[PDB]
Amino acid sequence: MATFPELLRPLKLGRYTLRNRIIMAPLTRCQATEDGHVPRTESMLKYYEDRASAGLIIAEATMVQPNYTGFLTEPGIYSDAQIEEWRKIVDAVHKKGGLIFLQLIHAGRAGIPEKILQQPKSDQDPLAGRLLAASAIPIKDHRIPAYFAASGEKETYGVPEELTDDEVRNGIIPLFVEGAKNAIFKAGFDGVEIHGANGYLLDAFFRESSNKRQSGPYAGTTIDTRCQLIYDVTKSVCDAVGSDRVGLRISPLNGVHGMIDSNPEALTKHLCKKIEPLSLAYLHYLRGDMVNQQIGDVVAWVRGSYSGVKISNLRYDFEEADQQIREGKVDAVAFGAKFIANPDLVERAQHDWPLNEPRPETYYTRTAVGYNDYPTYN
Ligand SMILES: Cc1cc2nc3c(=O)[nH]c(=O)nc-3n(C[C@H](O)[C@H](O)[C@H](O)COP(=O)(O)O)c2cc1C
């Protein structure tokens, strides 16, 4: 008898059928180039192909705005050079019979000032050379880690400029659309995930602590207007590539990057109802707080307010994932740290084999160490 039979069941998701419900969460590993944000092809190809038994891989946060870096050496999806290398990585995943979506990010107030502010403000890009956010409120009491910093030592987050409604509508949204078209039409990704989580640009409009806008369609003053940017980006991307190739990620309780909302339950339920008519491939959420402060039954909120495919994440083991699928609470579960450490995570679930332990101190080496050196089970 199978150990985790519900977790290992196929799942209809958008226009696809996943082989199982073990999802690889998006994981920034910094294995792209600093200058051009081009994937380090063979390194990333090995890493993703080694994990391609996953029902679905969500590839790491990938830049939609030229040079708007939050992680120093993350990949982009805005240039022809990036597209060509991604195409090869995606091909390798497909050769293993896998499926892969690309997570699309704008770092917002988590942009690296020492990189972004040294870019020339000229020509065909009015958003260039500027730190940009919902409001002019910097991330406080959290330094840029040494592994994301331009200098290789801790740096300070900057005070962002408040985006005008014009810049949001005519600058930001079209970048997400173009990025999605590039990813799917040109690189061959099966879909894209909109990054509406973890304190980055879209989440910064979504939650109270970061959106203090007093007017306009993206005002911080109501739940509906705070939901509007996530809706508008997601809708525009759906119109471009098909909603059956679009997912959305949110994190209503995650306190990273000074994120907090006074009413996450009402916020979450409203967003669920607002995005229902989009017929997304899935909604992906962090069910709690990495800081262990903010509490609430996000799984229940989403299940009661959203009729589509629900992917949950954060501190799941196989047993809990299997049980929540069994109970009809979620459709699938994404795993982060366990996929870093276990290329053959799915096979380990099939056999109930023990799991490799992650080494957090080597998450961001930019070499094979702590990246391509976790073995399969003997
Ligand atoms: C090294 C590392 C990189 C990550 N990069 C991303 C990212 O690019 N996008 C994202 O939405 N979440 C990212 N996360 C959060 C994970 O997707 C996931 O939500 C988190 O690891 C919690 O799941 P777990 O308990 O299964 O590890 C990252 C987490 C880690 C540890």
Helix, coil or strand: residue 83: helix
Cβ burial 290-319 (10 Å sphere, 16+ → b, else e): eeeebebebbebbbebbebbbbbbbebebe
According to DSSP, residue 186 is labeled I
H helix intervals, 96-167:
113-116, 165-167
Q: Could you tell me the resolution of this structure in angstroms?
A: 1.3
Give me the residues paired with residue 312 across strands.
285, 333
* Cβ neighbours of 335 (radius 10 Å): 25
Distance CA 259, CA 141 (A): 12
Q: How far apart are the first and last CA of the chain?
A: 22
H helix intervals, the chain:
41-49, 80-95, 113-116, 165-167, 173-181, 201-206, 223-241, 264-275, 298-305, 318-326, 337-341, 345-351
Whether 119 and 214 have beta carbons less than 8 Å apart is answered as no
Whether 335 and 345 have beta carbons less than 8 Å apart is answered as yes
Q: Which of 165, 77, 61 shows the shortest CA–CA distance to 110?
A: 61
Distance CA 61, CA 101 (A): 11
Cβ burial 48-75 (10 Å sphere, 16+ → b, else e): bbbbbbbbbbbbbbbbbbbbbbbbbbbb
Q: Which atom of ligand 1 is nearest to the CA of 198?
A: 11
What is the CA(1)–ligand 1 centre distance, in A?
Answer: 32
Distance CA 324, CA 250 (A): 19
- For residue 180, give the amino acid letter: A
Torsion sign over Cα 192, 60, 374, 359: negative
Whether 256 and 266 have beta carbons less than 8 Å apart is answered as no
> What is the widest separation between alpha-carbon atoms in the chain?
64
Q: Give residue ranges with CB within 6 A of ligand 1.
A: 25-28, 60-61, 103, 195, 197-198, 249, 286, 313-315, 335-338, 363
What is the CA(216)–ligand 1 centre distance, in A?
Answer: 32
CA dihedral 128, 131, 132, 134 (to 10 degrees): -170
Q: What pairing do the DSSP bridges indicate for beta strands 191-196 and 100-105?
A: parallel
Whether 39 and 85 have beta carbons less than 8 Å apart is answered as yes
Domains by residue range for the chain, with CATH: 1-378 (3.20.20.70)
Q: Which atom of ligand 1 is nearest to the CA of 363?
A: 1
Token pair 């306009």: residue: 216
Distance CA 311, CA 285 (A): 6
Q: Whose CA is nearest to atom 18 of ligand 1?
A: 336
Q: How far is CA 24 from the centre of its chain?
A: 11
- Which candidate in 16, 47, 48, 200 is catalytic? 200
Q: What angle do CA 39, 44, 45 make, to 5 degrees?
A: 110
Whether 188 and 245 have beta carbons less than 8 Å apart is answered as no
200 tagged catalytic = yes
Q: Which atom of ligand 1 is nearest to the CA of 193?
A: 11
- Tell me the best of 28, 200, 283 to mutate to test the pocket of ligand 1, counting ligand atoms within 8 Å of each CB and taking the most: 28
CA dihedral 166, 167, 168, 171 (to 10 degrees): 120
- For residue 250, give the amino acid letter: I
Distance CA 32, CA 82 (A): 9
What is the CA(179)–ligand 1 centre distance, in A?
Answer: 21
Give the relative orientation of helices 80-95 and 41-49 as an angle to the nearest 10 degrees: 30
Q: Whose CA is nearest to atom 14 of ligand 1?
A: 27
For the chain, the C-alpha Rg in angstroms (whole number) is 19
Helix, coil or strand: residue 247: strand
What is the CA(207)–ligand 1 centre distance, in A?
Answer: 19
Which contacts qualify for 221-230: CB closer than 8 Å, 24 or more apart? Answer: 223/263, 223/266, 223/267, 223/270, 224/270, 224/274, 226/267, 227/267, 227/270, 227/271, 227/274, 229/168, 229/202, 229/205, 230/194, 230/196, 230/202, 230/205, 230/206, 230/271, 230/275
Give me the residues paired with residue 284 across strands.
249, 311
Instruction: Indicate the annotated binding residues for FMN.
Output: 26, 28, 61, 103, 249, 313, 315, 336-337
- Residues in the chain followed by a break, C to N above 2.5 angstroms: none
Q: Whose CA is nearest to atom 12 of ligand 1?
A: 26
Phi, psi at residue 194, to the nearest 5°?
-75, 125
Method: X-ray
Instruction: Indicate the annotated binding residues.
Output: 26, 28, 61, 103, 249, 313, 315, 336-337
Q: Which of 89, 85, 98, 103 shows the shortest CA–CA distance to 51?
A: 98
Distance CA 58, CA 68 (A): 21
Q: Which atom of ligand 1 is nearest to the CA of 249?
A: 11
Q: Whose CA is nearest to atom 30 of ligand 1?
A: 27
- For residue 366, give the amino acid letter: R
* Cβ neighbours of 263 (radius 10 Å): 13
What is the CA(352)–ligand 1 centre distance, in A?
Answer: 24
Helix, coil or strand: residue 214: coil
